[PDB]
Amino acid sequence: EMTRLMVTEKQESKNFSKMAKSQSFSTRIEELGGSISFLTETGVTMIELPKTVSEHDMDQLLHDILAAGGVVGLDSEVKLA
């Protein structure tokens, strides 16, 4: 299970592009139950994260997104709930 955030990398959040690609963010949610999805056609990064992660991993890792300027949009909560 995993809630997918559609992040967009552009002059706004292009700081996020390589953040998600970083060794830290490559793994962070993947080991929790979610993962990364890059849609490089337009510059979107869909982060799937289950609310079954620890609140730290939920809040602060989806916030790691925002730390990178990455903007979070709700694709779907826990694999399309």
Is residue 7 a contact partner of residue 34, using CB atoms and an 8 Å limit?
Answer: no
Q: Give the span between the Cα atoms of 20 and 13, in whole angstroms.
A: 11
> What value, to the nearest 5°, has the Cα angle with vertex 72 and ends 68 and 44?
80
Strand pairing of 35-39 and 44-49? antiparallel
Which experimental approach was used here? Answer: NMR
β-sheet with 35-39: strand ranges across: 35-39, 44-49, 3-8, 74-76
Q: Is 65 in a helix, a strand, or coil?
A: helix
CA distances from 39 to 9, 31, 61, 70 (A): 10, 21, 20, 14
Work out whether strand 44-49 and strand 74-76 pair parallel, antiparallel, or are unpaired.
Answer: unpaired
Q: List domains and CATH numbers for the chain.
A: 1-81 (3.30.70.2380)
Q: Which two tokens stand for residue 38?
A: 């890059």
What token pair was written down for 17? 């592009």
Tokens representing residue 45 in the block: 């990064």
